[PDB]
Write a structure and sequence with these properties.
part of a larger assembly, 2 chains, A: about 300 residues, alpha+beta, six-stranded antiparallel β-sheet, five-stranded antiparallel β-sheet, about 30% strand, globular, B: about 50 residues, mainly beta, two-stranded antiparallel ribbon, PH-like_dom_sf (chain A), cilium biogenesis/degradation (chain A)
Amino acid sequence: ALWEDRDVRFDVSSQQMKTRPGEVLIDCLDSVEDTKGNNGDRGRLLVTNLRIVWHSLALPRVNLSIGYNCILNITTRTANSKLRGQTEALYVLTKCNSTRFEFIFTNLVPGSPRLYTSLIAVHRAYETSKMYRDFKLRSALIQNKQLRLLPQENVYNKINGVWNLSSDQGNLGTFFITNVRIVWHANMNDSFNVSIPYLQIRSVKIRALVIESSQQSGGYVLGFKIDPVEKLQESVKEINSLHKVYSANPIFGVDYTDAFVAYFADGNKQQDREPVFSEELGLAIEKLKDGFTLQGLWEV
Amino acid sequence: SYSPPELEGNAVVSYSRPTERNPDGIPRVSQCKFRLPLKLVCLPGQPSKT
């Protein structure tokens, strides 16, 4: 469903670069040349709400899309002294489904390098806010007896005595309904709580309050049971209404081809062999490559 | 005490043109020369025959 902040795509279409409903553009910069691919071609860089995009600005087909849940390090490099003005450069390190890429972005015209700052800022806002768009078990949600609300979140329905049909004897627990996510704590050792976001929900039906996950948190079917079913169907219908009105415009809580092969961070390596034990060092070491030895790789 | 070699004087401005290529500005220099009067270095005095 949502891939803009979960993958890293190359030669993306002119439509997938367009702002998703919940997405929103923040800052832009022209003439940002792309490097780590020596095409020597200019472009335009965009720091959106969920991902960073770069399109060639002359052949807008060739482009890059990097999600914020797939970046590890972002480094700004101020160099290239007096000969001209102090120009910056952006080094982004990315790891998607165990494959490490690195992209470099060179600001050609030294007259507008401010972009490289705001990105950093929003990236923090992307990581400090993951309870908005991700699924978590047994977190630190509950205060003394109440829920700790996110910034853009207020409770809708406050129901006591809502069971959980995934355990045996620690069930009876409160059920908080909010505009961003729905949570349930256990009211007895209140660290068995589940915080499901509307973004991860696929369909709320009955078989009993069955909630299915959207192929990202796996097929996690959650079952709850309440007092006589009047309030039950009431809660189900209001939950479906809130789900649809959210999916209309997502929130995301962010406050404020061979293309891949030319962007590997390792260098001609998209792999990680099976980590096996090492009797030489005593550490878990990556498997050695068909004849190589540790004391032969170490020396020069 | 000694009189200057010439009364003329120069005045030079060095400025910069901010351009897209060099946002810091290419440096240019232009000058103008003024002419000072004898009334600054001389006075009417007595003449001698030889």
